[PDB]
Amino acid sequence: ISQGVSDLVGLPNQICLQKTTSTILKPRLISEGVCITDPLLAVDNGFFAYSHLEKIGSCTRGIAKQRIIGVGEVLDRGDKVPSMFMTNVWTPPNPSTIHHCSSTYHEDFYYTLCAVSHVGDPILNSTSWTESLSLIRLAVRPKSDSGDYNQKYIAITKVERGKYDKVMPYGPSGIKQGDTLYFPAVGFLPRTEFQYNDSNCPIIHCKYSKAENCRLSMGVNSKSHYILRSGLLKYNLSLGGDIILQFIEIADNRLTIGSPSKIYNSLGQPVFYQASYSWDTMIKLGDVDTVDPLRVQWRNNSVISRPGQSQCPRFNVCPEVCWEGTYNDAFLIDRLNWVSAGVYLNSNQTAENPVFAVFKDNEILYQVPLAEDDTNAQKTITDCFLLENVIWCISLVEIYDTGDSVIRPKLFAVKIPAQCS
Amino acid sequence: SIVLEPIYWNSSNSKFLPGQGLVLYPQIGDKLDIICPKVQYEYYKVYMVDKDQADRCTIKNTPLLNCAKPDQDIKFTIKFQEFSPNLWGLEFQKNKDYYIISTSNGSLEGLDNQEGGVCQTRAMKILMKVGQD
Ligand SMILES: *[C@@H]1O[C@H](CO[C@@H]2O[C@@H](C)[C@@H](O)[C@@H](O)[C@@H]2O)[C@@H](O[C@@H]2O[C@H](CO)[C@@H](O[C@H]3O[C@H](CO[C@H]4O[C@H](CO)[C@@H](O)[C@H](O)[C@@H]4O)[C@@H](O)[C@H](O[C@@H]4O[C@H](CO)[C@@H](O)[C@H](O)[C@@H]4O)[C@@H]3O)[C@H](O)[C@H]2NC(C)=O)[C@H](O[C@H]2O[C@@H](C)[C@@H](O)[C@@H](O)[C@@H]2O)[C@H]1NC(C)=O
Ligand SMILES: *[C@@H]1O[C@H](CO)[C@@H](O[C@@H]2O[C@H](CO)[C@@H](O)[C@H](O)[C@H]2NC(C)=O)[C@H](O)[C@H]1NC(C)=O
Ligand SMILES: *[C@@H]1O[C@H](CO)[C@@H](O[C@@H]2O[C@H](CO)[C@@H](O)[C@H](O)[C@H]2NC(C)=O)[C@H](O)[C@H]1NC(C)=O
Ligand SMILES: *[C@@H]1O[C@H](CO)[C@@H](O)[C@H](O)[C@H]1NC(C)=O
Ligand SMILES: *[C@@H]1O[C@H](CO)[C@@H](O)[C@H](O)[C@H]1NC(C)=O
Ligand SMILES: *[C@@H]1O[C@H](CO)[C@@H](O)[C@H](O)[C@H]1NC(C)=O
């Protein structure tokens, strides 16, 4: 028997595996003029990584005030419910220059990869961005008078980007495989060097779509200088002295524009999630066939999508030239039946009505609202784990109700039920 | 607490006054639909622009609506809140003014016109005074 919080591995207690329309899920909430934004959550081995940016004013265009990068532990709060406790917090000096952080756990530390820019978000100012990456290492259990043990910068000697001009982390969390860490990343490729056959664009059954739409939707607009390609940044700790990050591109199997992504281990194998930021609006997740080169075995899911805008709203499947959507990941909790848990936004074109759902490729077995309808919600990050062999999920949800003073993320704890009736 | 009344973006809409267009006054939390109706079809690209671009009837941006499908109903919904599926930072701030225009001449050959068009000739423009009156 194993007590405490631990990775979703081995043989957990079985979970309810048929469709139920009644509420059997019970979300538990865990612990002026400001908006807290750009959130990150990672849960690995009883520890977690967290980050956010505090802004004065709007969440989009407010003045960046404080960046928090913290780690902690996930524990039994005594009553058989997980809760989170911060142990080590770091606030870098210039909050407006830190972008797109990504955290991966390895035994004593979380390693957090960020992008540094003096021109804003590299995605929105790609051509003016000078690629610059930062690495901060944080001990999950800090020690007094331990030198560089608690907090450490790591200087990156070399970046191996292949044919790409620029690369940077793109997504909340990555994994370790032995002593090698992988971060979700994105590569910047000039359109003139992009190798693509326009005849792979699936325009049959879409009379208004044209063969060029897929290639044109590989960048943030039709005439972007770059296209964005998802992948991984690889950091092999076993090497001596050398901090080298190499980019590993994702395969062109069900290719979509590079978007924030997550690679995680569930029941012992790597799983991948890529946000749907263009015309292919059905959820993109699946088991990883190969890590290098990165290849994802995408599920053929017909139940989960994301809100969009006019051109590619929720449930759009026909190739259009669009760049819109939300990041709402899902976490594989049973490979034998391929059931995952995650939060989706139950709206066609608006960021509202968050719903926690447990689902299969072609059906949602059970779900529950996290708030009321017309409650505003955005990015959601889900990680599920074991608490004395019961599957639990923790979801970070960007959420607020109209009229709130403070826009803040919330943490939700959901126990996955064992029996369905 | 409300869903505002939908705006049909076609020339026969009488709520676009001559020379003035439509003025709205939506409040924080409202929802709005801008619909390009189903079908002789009118073709538009509809944009959100600044005060100066609306007064001179010019565009220079990614459209909010791309009405080039005579077969289908195209819809755009806004909730006047901080969060959005827009990746360019679409937000609506109370006591701020937002302008929606189209520079198309209505024909398929004029979808991408960048001056004049149906904004200065039909006053097919929306003025949203967010969180006012
Ligand atoms: C949110 O958006 C949903 C998706 O909208 C659609 O997709 C996006 C990407 C855009 O392309 C939009 O323009 C699309 O509308 C929307 O749900 C859609 O709602 C449609 C009705 O408005 C509905 O019906 C249409 O298709 C059927 C046939 O459907 C077949 O295939 C699916 C695929 O699995 C099957 O599941 C279905 O069972 C069907 O077999 C048409 O028959 C129907 O039309 C009529 O059919 C005539 C043929 O004889 C035709 O000439 C004539 O046009 C008739 O009107 C529709 O055209 C879609 O099936 C549905 N899609 C999904 C995925 O659910 C949501 O609508 C809800 O809105 C409320 C108000 C209500 O209308 C509900 O029906 C609907 O679920 C959108 N939600 C909101 C809140 O707006
Ligand atoms: C990470 O780096 C280590 C260090 O080189 C790699 O391990 C070695 O790799 C080669 C090829 O497998 C062997 O010939 C060496 O004998 C290995 N030595 C040791 C001590 O492991 C490792 O393969 C690298 N892993 C990744 C994923 O890059
Ligand atoms: C999702 O659907 C695609 C297409 O239906 C599947 O791809 C097929 O996979 C089989 C087995 O690997 C191949 O023999 C076919 O050639 C593939 N292409 C087809 C049928 O067009 C894919 O395997 C499906 N993925 C999952 C997880 O079910
Ligand atoms: C992009 O970079 C330029 C400097 O090259 C800067 O002046 C401009 O404000 C930036 N804009 C955005 C949207 O990042
Ligand atoms: C694109 O694919 C088609 C058929 O799959 C092939 O005949 C064609 O040569 C390809 N295009 C190029 C430029 O090679
Ligand atoms: C629309 O504009 C194009 C040029 O931009 C012009 O050639 C065409 O005749 C115009 N059509 C109408 C109906 O105004």
Residue numbers in the entry:
A (entry chain A): 174 to 204, 213 to 602
B (entry chain B): 27 to 65, 72 to 92, 95 to 167
Would you copy out the relevant sentences from the publication that reported this structure?
The henipaviruses possess an attachment (G) and a fusion (F) glycoprotein which together work in concert to mediate the virus attachment and entry process, but the precise triggering mechanism of paramyxovirus fusion has yet to be defined in detail. Distinct from most other members within the subfamily Paramyxovirinae, the henipavirus attachment glycoprotein does not hemagglutinate and neither binds to sialic acid, nor retains neuraminidase activity, and instead binds cell surface protein receptors. Recently, ephrin-B2 and ephrin-B3 were identified as the functional receptors for both HeV and NiV.
Four copies of complex were observed in the asymmetric unit of the crystal. The complex buries an interface of 1272 Å2, slightly smaller than the 1354 Å2 buried in the NiV-G/ephrin-B3 complex and the 1393 Å2 - in NiV-G/ephrin-B2 complex. Ephrin-B2 (S27-D167) used in our structural studies here was expressed in stably-transfected human HEK293 cells. Thus, its glycosylation pattern is more physiologically relevant than in the previously published structures, which used ephrin expressed in either yeast, bacteria or in the presence of glycosylation inhibitor. In addition to the previously observed glycosylation site N36, we now observe another glycosylation site - N139, which is consistent with sequence-based predictions. These conformational changes within this ephrin region are necessary to fit its four hydrophobic residues (F, P, L and W) within the G-H loop into their binding pockets on the HeV-G surface.
